[PDB]
Amino acid sequence: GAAESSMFNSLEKNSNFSGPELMRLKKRFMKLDKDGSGSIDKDEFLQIPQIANNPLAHRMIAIFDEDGSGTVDFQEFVGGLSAFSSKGGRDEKLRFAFKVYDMDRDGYISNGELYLVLKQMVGNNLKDQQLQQIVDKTIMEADKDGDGKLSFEEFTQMVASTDIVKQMTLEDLF
Amino acid sequence: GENLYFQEIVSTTERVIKDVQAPAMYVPTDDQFWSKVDKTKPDIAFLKNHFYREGRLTEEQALYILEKGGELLRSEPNLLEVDAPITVCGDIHGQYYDLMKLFEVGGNPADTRYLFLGDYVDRGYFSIECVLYLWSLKMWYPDTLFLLRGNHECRHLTDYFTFKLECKHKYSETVYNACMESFCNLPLAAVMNKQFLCIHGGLSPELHTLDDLRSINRFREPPTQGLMCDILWADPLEDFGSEKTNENFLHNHVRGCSYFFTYNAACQFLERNNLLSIIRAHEAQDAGYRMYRKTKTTGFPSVMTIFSAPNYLDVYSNKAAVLKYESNVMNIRQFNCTPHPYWLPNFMDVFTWSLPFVGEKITDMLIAILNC
Amino acid sequence: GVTVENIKEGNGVDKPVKGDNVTIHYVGTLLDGSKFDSSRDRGTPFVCRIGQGQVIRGWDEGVPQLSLGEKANLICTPDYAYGARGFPPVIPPNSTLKFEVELLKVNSKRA
Ligand SMILES: C=CC[C@@H]1/C=C(\C)C[C@H](C)C[C@H](OC)[C@H]2O[C@@](O)(C(=O)C(=O)N3CCCC[C@H]3C(=O)O[C@H](/C(C)=C/[C@@H]3CC[C@@H](O)[C@H](OC)C3)[C@H](C)[C@@H](O)CC1=O)[C@H](C)C[C@@H]2OC
Ligand SMILES: [Ca+2]
Ligand SMILES: [Ca+2]
Ligand SMILES: [Ca+2]
Ligand SMILES: [Ca+2]
Ligand SMILES: [Fe+3]
Ligand SMILES: [Zn+2]
């Protein structure tokens, strides 16, 4: 099929996967797409077990939707998984973490963005005043151009101590 | 362009919780730092609020405070001879915002004479503020404010606990090494009104007369054992006054070093050196202070413990205390804690704190997708 | 893997099970007694769904051994805490943790 052939060789060049792996991803991709619509809906995602009771479910789906159509097609499904490849680069894994706190996808992390994302994960275990304070100090220490917002470079120069490669990798998968 | 509003609504484009003050983003200028009355000393009125708002100084500014205070402490002898009236304070342990209520309870340093027994750092996450404040205070009142050395004013415990991490975080290691060399100039003891020996820890089997304190070379780090160690580490025995042993000293298996001293040990020291009591700190008291057994010769408590850190470690929920002493009357005032801003454990920024949970849960879902 | 030392008695009737929502105040100390974190620092008890992998194995197996209102000492070996990796800035590798916990609430039943 000339149609599917163009999307296949394209993903084989951009993704950190190989041809044989992309066939297995297409298998599970169709295993979730229960209505055969060629994409995955939010109700189709939350239909999985571990995904439903997960505080980062809505964040993961949003990052996968690179265009923002409420659906995850195969090109997006492969793009989101490529960052977690054992053969994947360090910069690729850091960008997925950055997008977790960048809700509006404007390339910067703001005071409100940081507070809202954390409060969702934290809950009531931190007082609202306590989370706002630790967000205030985190930004001012990471900001170096006085914009009051955190760019990707300022985010990397702060999580350098953290080993994200171990956090953001699957290895045995695929 | 994407613009998100969350439901009374709020957007990501502004601070969500507004009632909480934001930190001091800007290091002070030369007009703010230097006093208008004396050009060689910092402005206490500015520093107090600047540190209250979680502000920070230049590296040059912090170093000047530690070196100019260190020159004052070095000139002072090992054994101070302070005079009444005076306010004696216990441990503060990096609790800067309680140090503010301490000075309201004890008195304004311009009108009052102070004696701190050390332990200004560690545990609390505002330790460099207490130091840079009190060191600045020493510059303004070197004849009326006296600071002593606790077991935490060294390289040993600051590296083992939180103070070395704080200096590395809020300033630099150059400040830390400047802070440690400044601590070595702190006097070790004090004789208040020719009646009370004032130390941090307690007595020692090498401490016999006050002349033994005068012979110490205090310009080093506290050793593993000996006089200079036990001065900062010794505790009274648990059953003090009610002891079941005729021993004068016993090994301190609680601290791991130095000794316990007993009632008979304290009384012998007071009787040989014509002293009325021993005023020390070290041990956190749930009531802020503690009176030990009265001497058989004078009826005055042999040892007094004074603790000035309220709600120690934010879990103890204890009281603090200061010793407002005059010869006619001895008044021990107690105060309660004051809210302080929140810090994650070990000064963690938000991302180091949250990424492991993100890296786990995001990974949990990806694995669940690969096994449908 | 985890040992439960009783400080104060509980009611001995209301014990958490897998799926229950517990509310616990705690204070975490290393073997050397130096504290690393405490919910009492934040003046708010810690809540979680016990027995579902949401917290470390020392908690997911020790909280069921408690009763409502009981003060306890959860002493977790590294294999039941954070392991040979530890927490990068807080919990050193191969650390044995001690959580002094107080089961304030199970589900919605207050103590
Ligand atoms: C902002 C989002 C993060 C989110 C943070 C909160 C909800 C605030 C909450 C009070 C955590 C504290 O924040 C001040 C702080 O509490 C500690 O100090 C602590 O006393 C501790 O040991 N606790 C907390 C009380 C329950 C037991 C244990 C825990 O199970 O903690 C859990 C934990 C870290 C599990 C890791 C996850 C990574 C795996 O790799 C690892 O597997 C080995 C196990 C916590 C509850 C996570 O489920 C949820 C989070 O992490 C940790 C020393 C470090 C931790 O900061 C993270
Ligand atoms: Ca679909
Ligand atoms: Ca799409
Ligand atoms: Ca943004
Ligand atoms: Ca910036
Ligand atoms: Fe102390
Ligand atoms: Zn001490």
Three-class SS of chain B: CCCCEECCCEECCCCCCCCCCCCCCCCCCHHHHECCCCCCCECHHHHHHHHHCCCCCCHHHHHHHHHHHHHHHHHCCCEEEECCCEEEECCCCCCHHHHHHHHHHHCCCCCCCEEECCCCCCCCCCHHHHHHHHHHHHHHCCCCEEECCCCCCCHHHHHHCCHHHHHHHHCCHHHHHHHHHHHCCCCCEEEECCCEEECCCCCCCCCCCHHHHHCCCCCCCCCCCCHHHHHHHCEECCCCCCCCCCCCEEECCCCCCCEEECHHHHHHHHHHHCCCEEEECCCCCCCCEEECCECCCCCCECEEEECCCCCHHHCCCCCEEEEEECCCCEEEEEECCCCCCCCCHHHCCHHHHHHHHHHHHHHHHHHHHCCC
Contacts of C90 in chain B (CB under 8 A): 345-346, 348
State how far the alpha carbon of B49 is from the alpha carbons of B45, B53, B130, in Å.
7, 6, 13
What kind of experiment solved this structure?
X-ray
* Interface-testing mutation among B314, B317, B360, with chain C (most C C-beta atoms within 10 A): B314
State how far the alpha carbon of C106 is from the alpha carbons of A44, B223, C23, in Å.
33, 50, 6
Whether B315 contacts C38, CB under 8 Å: yes
- Using CA coordinates, name the residue in chain C closest to A159: C88
Whether the bond into B85 is cis, omega within 30 of 0: yes
Q: How far apart are CA B159 and CA C34, in angstroms?
A: 13
Q: How far apart are CA C34 and CA B162, in angstroms?
A: 10
Residue A138: strand, helix, or coil:
helix
Residues paired with residue C23 on neighbouring β-strands, in sequence order: C47, C105
Residue C33 touches partner B, C-beta closer than 8 Å: no
Residues paired with residue B11 on neighbouring β-strands, in sequence order: B5
Q: Which residues have C-beta within 8 Å of that of residue A43, sequence separation ≥ 6? A: none
Amino acid at C60: D
Ligand 1 and C104: CB distance under 6 A = no
Ligand 1 and A131: CB distance under 6 A = no
Is B156 catalytic? The answer is: no
Q: Which of C47, C85, C88 lies nearest to residue A125, judging by beta carbons?
A: C47
Interface of B with A in 332-371 (CB under 8 A): 341-344, 349-370
Whether B74 contacts B186, CB under 8 Å: no
Residues paired with residue C109 on neighbouring β-strands, in sequence order: C106
Amino acid at C35: K
Q: What is the CATH number of the domain that holds B339?
A: 3.60.21.10
Q: How far apart are CA B140 and CA B108, in angstroms?
A: 12
Interval between CA A22 and ligand 3 midpoint (Å): 19
**Domains in chain C: boundaries:** 1-111
Residue A123: strand, helix, or coil:
coil
Interval between CA B348 and ligand 4 midpoint (Å): 22
Smallest Cα distance from A167 to chain B, Å: 5
Ligand 1, atom 51, lies closest to the CA of B357
Nearest to A111 by CA among B33, B336, B15, B299: B15
Task: Tell which atom from ligand 1 comes closest to the C-alpha of C37.
Answer: 18
Is C44 in contact with A126 (Cβ distance < 8 A)? Answer: yes
Tokens representing residue C11 in the block: 């009611």
Q: Which residues have C-beta within 8 Å of that of residue B255, sequence separation ≥ 6? A: B233, B235
Ligand 1 binding pocket mutation candidate from C2, C27, C35, C37 (most atoms within 8 A of CB): C37
Residue A9: strand, helix, or coil:
helix
**Domains in chain A: boundaries:** 1-174
Tokens representing residue C23 in the block: 């509310």
Residue A162 touches partner C, C-beta closer than 8 Å: yes
Ligand 1 and A121: CB distance under 6 A = yes
Q: How many CA atoms lie within 13 A of A105 on its CB side?
A: 11
Instruction: Please tell me which chains touch B, using 3 or more CB pairs under 8 Å as the contact test.
Output: A, C
Residue C41 touches partner B, C-beta closer than 8 Å: yes
Contacts of C27 in chain B (CB under 8 A): 315
Distance from the Cα of residue B239 to its chain's centroid: 27
Q: How far apart are CA B311 and CA B316, in angstroms?
A: 5
Tokens representing residue B117 in the block: 């027994």
Tokens representing residue A138 in the block: 């985190």
Is C40 in contact with B348 (Cβ distance < 8 A)? Answer: no
Amino acid at B140: W
Q: What is the DSSP letter of A31?
A: H
Burial class (CB in 10 A: 0-12, 13-18, 19+), B372: exposed
State how far the alpha carbon of B259 is from the alpha carbons of B203, B220, B233, B249, in Å.
8, 21, 8, 6
Domain that holds residue B172: 1-372
Ligand 1 and C55: CB distance under 6 A = yes
Is C80 catalytic? The answer is: no
Phi, psi of A154 (to 5 degrees): -70, -30
Residue B313 touches partner A, C-beta closer than 8 Å: no
Encode B86-118: b = buried (16+ Cβ within 10 Å), e = exposed: bbbbbbbbbbbbbbebbbebbbebeebbbbbbb
Q: Beta strands of C58-96 (E only): which ranges?
A: 71-76
Interval between CA B218 and ligand 2 midpoint (Å): 77
Q: Count how many residues are written for chain B.
A: 372
Q: How far apart are CA B134 and CA B139, in angstroms?
A: 9
Q: How many CA atoms lie within 13 A of B185 on its CB side?
A: 19
Q: How far apart are CA A168 and CA A61, in angstroms?
A: 16
Q: How far apart are CA B178 and CA B308, in angstroms?
A: 26
Instruction: Please tell me which chains touch C, using 3 or more CB pairs under 8 Å as the contact test.
Output: A, B
Interval between CA A41 and ligand 3 midpoint (Å): 9
Task: Show the CA angle centred on residue B269, arms to residues B264 and B270, nearest 5°.
Answer: 100
β-strand C97-106 against C27-29: which pairing, if any?
antiparallel
Nearest to B270 by CA among B304, B307, B295: B295
How far the first Cα of chain A sits from its last, in Å, is 24
- Using CA coordinates, name the residue in chain C closest to B313: C41
Architecture of domain C1-111: Roll (3.10)
Is C46 catalytic? The answer is: no
Q: How far apart are CA B291 and CA B299, in angstroms?
A: 12
Q: How far apart are CA B273 and CA A10, in angstroms?
A: 91
Whether C94 contacts C86, CB under 8 Å: yes
Residue A130 touches partner C, C-beta closer than 8 Å: yes
B29-33 long-range contacts (CB < 8 A, ≥24 apart) are B33/B57, B33/B61
Q: How far apart are CA A128 and CA A112, in angstroms?
A: 12
Whether B35 contacts B41, CB under 8 Å: yes
Burial class (CB in 10 A: 0-12, 13-18, 19+), B142: middle
Distance from the Cα of residue B27 to its chain's centroid: 24
Q: Which residues have C-beta within 8 Å of that of residue B208, sequence separation ≥ 6? A: B269, B272
Place of tokens 């992390």: A109
* Interface-testing mutation among A140, A155, A158, with chain B (most B C-beta atoms within 10 A): A140
The ligand that comes nearest to the alpha carbon of residue C24 is 1
Tokens representing residue B368 in the block: 């669940």
Q: What is the DSSP track for C17-42?
A: -TT-EEEEE-EEE-TT--EEEEHHHH
Whether C71 contacts C111, CB under 8 Å: no
Q: Which residues have C-beta within 8 Å of that of residue B223, sequence separation ≥ 6? A: B229
Is B356 in contact with C87 (Cβ distance < 8 A)? Answer: yes
Phi, psi of A66 (to 5 degrees): -70, -30
Q: How far apart are CA B334 and CA B105, in angstroms?
A: 8
Residue A32 touches partner C, C-beta closer than 8 Å: no
Smallest Cα distance from A2 to chain B, Å: 28
Residue A157: strand, helix, or coil:
coil
Ligand 1, atom 41, lies closest to the CA of C82
Q: How far apart are CA C97 and CA B273, in angstroms?
A: 47
Q: Beta strands of C1-111 (E only): which ranges?
A: 2-8, 21-25, 27-29, 35-38, 46-49, 71-76, 97-106, 109-110
> Which residue in B50, B152, B169, B251 is the catalytic one?
B152
Interval between CA B284 and ligand 6 midpoint (Å): 7
The ligand that comes nearest to the alpha carbon of residue A114 is 4
Give the CATH fold of the A1-174 domain: Recoverin; domain 1 (1.10.238)
Nearest to C12 by CA among C81, C82, C65: C65
